[PDB]
Design a protein around this ligand. Sequence first.
Ligand code: A1L4S
Ligand code: A1L4S
Ligand code: CO
Ligand code: CO
Lengths: 376, 376
Amino acid sequence: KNPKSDKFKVKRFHHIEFWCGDATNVARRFSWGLGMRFSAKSDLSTGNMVHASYLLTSGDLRFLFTAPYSPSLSAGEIKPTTTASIPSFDHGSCRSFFSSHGLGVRAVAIEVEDAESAFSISVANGAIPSSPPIVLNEAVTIAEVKLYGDVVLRYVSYKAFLPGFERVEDASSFPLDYGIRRLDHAVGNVPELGPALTYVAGFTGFHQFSGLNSAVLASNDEMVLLPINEPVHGTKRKSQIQTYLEHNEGAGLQHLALMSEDIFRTLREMRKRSSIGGFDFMPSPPPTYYQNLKKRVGDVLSDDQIKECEELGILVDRDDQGTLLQIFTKPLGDRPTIFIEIIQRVGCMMYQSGGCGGFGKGNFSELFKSIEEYEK
Amino acid sequence: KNPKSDKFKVKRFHHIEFWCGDATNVARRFSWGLGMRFSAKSDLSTGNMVHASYLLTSGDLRFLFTAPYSPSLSAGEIKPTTTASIPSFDHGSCRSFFSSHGLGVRAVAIEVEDAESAFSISVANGAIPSSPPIVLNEAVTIAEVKLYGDVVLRYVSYKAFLPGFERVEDASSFPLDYGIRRLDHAVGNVPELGPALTYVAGFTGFHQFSGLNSAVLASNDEMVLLPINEPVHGTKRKSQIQTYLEHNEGAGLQHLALMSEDIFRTLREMRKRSSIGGFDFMPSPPPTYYQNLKKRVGDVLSDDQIKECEELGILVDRDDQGTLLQIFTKPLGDRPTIFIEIIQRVGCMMYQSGGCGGFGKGNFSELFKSIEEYEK
Ligand SMILES: CCCOc1nc2c(C)c(C(=O)C3=C(O)CCCC3=O)ccc2n(C)c1=O
Ligand SMILES: CCCOc1nc2c(C)c(C(=O)C3=C(O)CCCC3=O)ccc2n(C)c1=O
Ligand SMILES: [Co+2]
Ligand SMILES: [Co+2]
């Protein structure tokens, strides 16, 4: 059931912003590893004396990488006179975030009908304010509230990327594309699920859609999906959620799930590049798992299509309404914290409805069971 | 003339260590951009709870990328019980370096006959101690003295990479190679050249080999070359050296010159990758400059060879004894601070003697003059 209880009008995921120590090297790594094009910049060359911000795009997916310059470059500035293109940016908050957590997501940004009203309604409904609504060039409004840990939910609304950003010139934007098209969901880890759910669901009106307890929060059309995990203690293998919290110094964003229009092509392109600057993938399931695939999704995937999943290490799950293919990268940076999921959903055609096929929770049982059989 | 006045026995450049915020993303970018293989690691997987260090190699060139983990992971440790593989590492110094300067070189490491004696003699001769000699696994000795700004000169000596580092497994080490073979020289920028020269020459015994004043310090066989620049003020175009100091928050390493066994192949491979994760190059000189090449180095480079320089944007200079080909990357990171030079030297065969052909100071005049002609 879906009560459609959003307290303000939400459209779609807009962008994800990483807070980095050096935005250049992270953006170039990600661009090559994921096949995203350099689309926009705000930095010294565009008159920004405060922060370096570089935007990568693939389809509707927008990754923003931001790092601070020396505060000395903007010491004369005040907020009314700032050359920063993102008014919420603060040297101290950025350095403190990155020092405490390492490389990771600062902002999950959603496009809303009216960022000012979204901020007002959120805070009136218990959201902790982070950056008040600011109108950029009489064209765009941006506001931020706290989401979990040091991650903010960022609202952007447009009258008609951001003012102050420049479109990068052609020689600098090579048209990489491995098939990734949009952000499917963004998942946080917290020490206690209950209070985090009540806080976020409380100010948004989003409704509810081993080693972990989890629940998914969703907007009215369920195209904005924000799962949250908590650890399950006392268990045999130490909870991966608890390991995240220890190495991240507390709550934060665990994984971004990126939808591909062709997960076979995406994974072929990404795996070709894993050892030459790209991203590594988690270990593949045993051949047991892909033998059992015929019995699970035989009417969905060809024998050749299922063999392709096994070559690429793709996981497949299925619920009442649809089928999802999925795979997970190793952590994106030094710490075992944030990672990426590549996903493609089959079914639920009306457009495809958000969340079609679930989030892969059935693959816990299939993996354990397939692992048991391989040992034989 | 060469007085051969080294106060201790120096062999060769050993490695360059970058202090990063995230060593993973910088190392992967550099590996792809420069064609260096992943050779060794010290991190959580090898029992290092303190820092992540990843070593890239190309020929004899060794690039080390290091970042701190959360101090919380090693809070119980003391220096006698540390799991760090580099005993000079300190969470606070690393965070402070990176926060103040951004991505850059912390250590220029040279291999010496006896790091303990090198440290003792250096400090006895005015060097500012940074990390005392420490013997690793009864096999390697490491010590550090201050060089300029927050950059240290690191001494390593071997009895027979470092203890505590693991050789990376084969699936993780793709054998990239674009022809780079060793570090030719490493250059610092300081506000005042005189006192920096007197300090470094004072404790090493190294001898002396627009917009800047510069001088090169050299070991006995002149295979360790450490130039130092200072700005020239009052001039028309603002000094690039002064711009470095402003954006770097003071003195530090300006550029690493990497010798290639085939600069044509290196530059073809690097330029192919500039816009897909690699490094960008400075703007090429006008076709004027390459027309004048025939009159300058005609007896050295074929017409086809000189046309190849023009396709790749290679600079060529020549002194009494040899010829050098050279080109400069744009800055390696967000700030206009550190960059890389690719170099190949022709001549001075006895082996090739260090510094053959100079450092390209003649190309200032040729560029200005060639620029004047292009405007015509
Ligand atoms: C071992 C089972 C399959 O392998 C894995 N699957 C994972 C999945 C399926 C997710 C995930 O995407 C997800 C949930 O699990 C529910 C909340 C919404 C959501 O996005 C996250 C991490 C996973 N890890 C680490 C695995 O090792
Ligand atoms: C404009 C003239 C050629 O273009 C350039 N040449 C450069 C050279 C030749 C060097 C350099 O390598 C060097 C010296 O100049 C003397 C001290 C030892 C040394 O290593 C450094 C920077 C340069 N930049 C920025 C240029 O734009
Ligand atoms: Co997921
Ligand atoms: Co040079």
